[PDB]
């Protein structure tokens, strides 16, 4: 029967390939194995095409399911660590460290993410959900000599196991409030009577579902693991670690929690009017490119949770083609500010103002990154926000979109003022690159992945919305698999 | 002056308090990786006096 | 002769909850640090009471065995006689963490009294090495392969995090514009 | 409900025992009239090792004890827990952990 | 002993690791301190395993994941602490606030 985590055990060959390959070769190894980990990757995406049309079983004595959703997020999770090994190739490879050790730690939070989107049992879900989080602690602070690294990857320690026992605790009562039944479908018929000790299950669990996401109570690691990790871990924990937290958060509270439902469509309303709020006006007063970065995947977050408190076959829906083209924006954001940091060091604002003289495929690149993450047309993020609304109107939720409006323009200001401060200052107004760009090149060691990992994202954040039929129909067929 | 201080006055008062709604809650976060963990245990506290009424 | 199993379970739930203090209270880390084999002893004490064998076998060789002496070894690394006692560092913000705390417990005691738990009335443990091995290979099987890769990716994380760097520490290894070694090309700047 | 049995002497082995030292030395107590420890991260480095490895024997007694009653699909589930974690010892030798 | 009994256990030794969690000043307290929660969770799922669901154990299984989990993240957590201490000297949590705002 285990023929449905095929896309799964293609990575766990794949993580041991590019690690035996660090032992035996050491460090002229990173040459070739870069590309040996695309080919898992990209194996493990086209073999889901064979099980998208298989009849969605649920292999492994029920611990795993393999439906539409969960063939869906096992999709985008594996790609966000697709675009991630095509930048790091030369980033983490510039600053000293063994590349071959970097992706054995990265395809493990992939297989880890892997098997949160389809896990079925209570003790199947938190092994998955701590091996992308055990994972995600030693990528933060690989650096391990920059004295901000250090300080980023001890404030999500402190944190993930923090919220990690918060999950385990709403795990082990919801062991405990039906007779047994560690599986997920086993607990909805045997509890239904909403009284007290499962809304205590219920609270303890989405304090780790809504971690993984960061909503706004639960943001505080955000800011400050993003300025301090290194650039291509951030470009996974904020497409790769959100959509496996936004697949749990579909997982568990449809099929756990279908008795109570009044109370996690509001909890996460309330996740949901907040953190539109300090994700979009915290952005503002920031400096940082990562940093920036970081306050807007706060409230990104915001603004795909209102296609999840509708409830409707078009509301989660809705969610699922945000995050397919939120892929396609932040890897191409942070590829970018990767792009940026790699010539000149200080990848920060105030010291883009003076390009599109000087590497124009990046201010290009860039801006239709950053644009679209507002909301202009006809770029991708103008498209997912209009199903987004779209799907909010049609079921009750008037007031959901529109703090999802007033805040969408305040999000605004502050792409712009990057975009700003890149096409519009003048050659008498430019502080670093003033004759001190690199003289780009695109053939030194890895720096020919970024170039086709910028394209082929800009690319597909242009097209995504006027090309949106085929995806739209890919999104919506994956849907009828949610109670 | 009236239009360049009173119509125009307002607009630019829009900007200005939530320019400072952004220079308010960017002191929420103040490192302290402690203090990020109340917060994350209040509103557990919260939550289940919210949803049980 | 069920009278002593009363007594052995209150003596043991007052073995943890001193020591717990102890892990947390105490002034001294190292007396802090041996303490917390009192917990991982006296909880796998409790495991026996309730039924549980092999689980409180399973604990003291990984608790008290592996990780309390990893937490030992990790505090005879650091202990650098600096202590600077600023204890009004800044605010009274260590009665505030008691408030959320003694809420938390509040509301869990709430939670347990009131709600109708179904506890059966069958003998429980028929060898429960086989009906715990039986599940590792039939039910539980891809939470215990996946045991097997979050502990090789905690092997290759721990070590490159904890290691030496006397392979080389001055290694200028190339340049667009300046990096330091093992370190984020993102140099730190204020505007 | 306590269907353990076997651990009735248990608790009684495990005060006399205790009382061994504290009435010995009890016994004993009516007769008798530039401290730098250099930071060097190997007692660190010996000690991660044996937790991944203190972790995969427990992992594998279930197995050893109901391995003749299992057959042989459990013996190839479980070669992958062992196979990869000797990918785990092959690590620790060559990036010089454990070297002392 | 009832089940009764070692729930008000758990959910006592759950608030002493959340208020090492909070207030405690080392950095390797808070490890300690993290520890305590990762038994609560395990002295609830034995406890919940032998009163309810005693013929087939499906929590003392559940308890073993978990021993596994907080020994390989605590293994992870002090190779960080560890990290610290090589470029800050001091282990102090009121001296990691340089990520501020």
């Not at chain 1, 766990?12 to 990173?30: M, N, P």
């Not at chain 2, 200005?16 to 963990?37: D, H």
């Amino acid at each position: 029967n285990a023929g449905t985590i095929l896309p799964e055990t293609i990575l766990i060959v794949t993580l041991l390939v590019v690690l035996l390959a660090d032992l035996i070769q050491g460090r002229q190894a990173d040459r070739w194995t870069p590309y040996f980990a695309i080919v898992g990757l990209g194996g493990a995406i086209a073999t889901m095409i064979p099980l998208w049309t298989q009849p969605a079983t649920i292999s492994f004595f029920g611990s795993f399911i393999s439906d539409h959703l969960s063939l869906f997020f096992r999709g985008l999770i594996a790609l966000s660590a697709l675009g991630t090994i095509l930048m790091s190739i030369r980033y983490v490879e510039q600053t000293g460290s063994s590349l071959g050790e970097f992706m054995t730690i990265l395809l493990t939070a992939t297989v880890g993410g892997m098997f949160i989107a389809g896990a079925q049992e209570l003790v199947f879900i938190f092994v998955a959900l701590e091996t992308l989080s055990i994972a995600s602690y030693l990528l933060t602070g690989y650096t391990k000599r920059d004295s901000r690294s250090n300080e980023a990857a001890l404030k999500y320690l402190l944190i993930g196991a923090a919220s990690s026992a918060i999950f385990l605790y709403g795990s082990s009562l919801l062991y405990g409030l039906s007779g047994g039944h560690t599986q997920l479908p086993a607990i909805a018929q045997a509890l239904s009577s909403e009284s007290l000790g499962l809304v205590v299950a219920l609270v303890f669990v989405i304090a780790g579902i809504s971690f993984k996401i960061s909503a706004v109570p639960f943001h505080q690691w955000t800011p400050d693991v993003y300025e301090g990790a290194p650039t291509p871990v951030v470009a996974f924990l904020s497409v790769g670690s959100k959509a496996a937290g936004f697949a749990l958060a579909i997982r568990f509270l449809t099929l756990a929690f279908p008795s109570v439902t009044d109370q996690w469509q509001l909890i996460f309303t309330v996740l949901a009017i907040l953190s539109m709020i300090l994700g979009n006006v915290v952005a503002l007063a920031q400096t940082s490119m990562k940093r920036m970065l970081a306050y807007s995947s706060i409230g990104q977050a915001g603004f795909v949770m209102i296609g999840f408190v509708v409830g409707t076959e078009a509301g989660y829906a809705s969610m699922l083609f945000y995050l397919l083209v939120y892929l396609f924006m932040n890897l191409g954001a942070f590829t970018c500010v990767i792009l940026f940091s790699l010539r000149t060091g200080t990848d920060q604002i105030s010291e883009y103002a003076g390009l599109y003289q000087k590497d124009p495929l990046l201010t290009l690149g860039l801006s239709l990154c950053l644009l679209s993450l507002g909301g202009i047309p006809p770029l991708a993020g103008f498209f997912g926000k209009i199903y987004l609304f779209w799907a909010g109107w049609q079921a009750g939720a008037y007031g959901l979109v529109l703090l999802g409006l007033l805040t969408s323009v305040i999000s605004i200001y502050y792409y712009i003022r990057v975009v700003k401060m890149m096409v519009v200052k003048e050659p008498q107004e430019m502080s670093e690159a003033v004759r001190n760009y690199p003289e780009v090149s695109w053939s030194s060691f890895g720096l020919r992945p970024l170039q086709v990992g910028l394209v082929m994202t800009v690319i597909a954040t242009s097209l995504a919305g006027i090309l949106a039929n085929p995806l739209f129909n890919l999104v919506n067929t994956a849907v009828w698999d949610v109670p | 002056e009236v239009d360049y201080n009173v119509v125009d006055g307002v607009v630019n008062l829009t900007g200005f308090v939530t320019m400072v709604t952004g220079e308010g809650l960017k002191y929420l976060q103040n490192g302290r990786a402690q203090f990020y963990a109340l917060i994350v245990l209040l509103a557990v506290l919260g939550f289940v006096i919210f949803s049980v009424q | 002769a069920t009278l002593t199993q009363t007594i052995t379970f209150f003596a043991l739930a007052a073995a943890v909850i001193i020591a717990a203090l102890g892990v947390v209270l105490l002034d001294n880390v190292v007396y802090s640090a041996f303490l917390l084999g009192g917990v991982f002893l006296s909880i796998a004490g409790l495991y026996i009471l309730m039924n549980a064998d092999f689980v409180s076998a399973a604990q003291i060789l990984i608790y008290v065995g592996a990780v309390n002496v990893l937490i030992l070894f990790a505090i005879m690394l650091v202990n650098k006689r600096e202590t600077y006692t600023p204890v009004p560092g800044r605010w009274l913000r260590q009665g505030g963490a008691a408030v959320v705390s003694l809420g938390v417990f509040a509301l869990l005691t709430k939670m347990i009294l009131q709600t109708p738990w179904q506890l059966s009335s069958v003998p429980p443990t028929p060898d429960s090495i086989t009906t715990i091995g039986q599940h590792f290979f039939s039910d539980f099987l891809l939470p215990f392969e996946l045991a097997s890769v979050l502990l090789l990716m905690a092997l290759i994380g721990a070590v490159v995090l904890a290691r030496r760097e006397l392979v080389l520490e001055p290694e200028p290894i190339l340049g667009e514009e300046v990096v330091p070694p093992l370190e984020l090309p993102e140099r730190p700047r204020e505007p | 409900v306590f269907v353990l049995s076997g651990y009735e002497y248990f608790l009684g082995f495990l005060i006399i025992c205790s009382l061994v030292p504290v009435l010995a030395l009890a016994a004993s107590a009516l007769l008798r009239p530039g401290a730098w420890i250099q930071f060097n991260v190997r007692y660190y480095m010996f000690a991660l090792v044996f937790v991944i490895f203190d972790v995969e024997t427990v992992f594998l007694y279930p197995w050893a004890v109901a391995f003749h009653q299992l057959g042989l699909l459990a013996f190839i589930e479980a070669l992958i827990f062992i196979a990869i974690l000797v990918v785990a010892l092959v690590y620790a030798w060559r990036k010089r952990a454990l070297e002392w | 002993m009832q089940l009764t009994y070692v729930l008000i256990l758990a959910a006592l030794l759950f608030c002493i690791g959340i208020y090492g969690l909070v207030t405690s000043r080392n950095a390797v307290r808070v490890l300690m301190s993290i520890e305590l929660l990762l038994n609560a969770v395990n002295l609830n799922l034995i406890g919940f395993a032998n009163y309810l669901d005693g013929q087939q154990i499906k929590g003392q299984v559940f308890a073993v994941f978990v021993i596994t989990v907080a020994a390989a993240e605590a293994a992870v957590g002090l190779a960080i602490i560890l990290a610290i201490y090589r470029n800050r000297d001091t282990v102090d949590m009121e001296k990691f606030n340089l990520l501020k705002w």
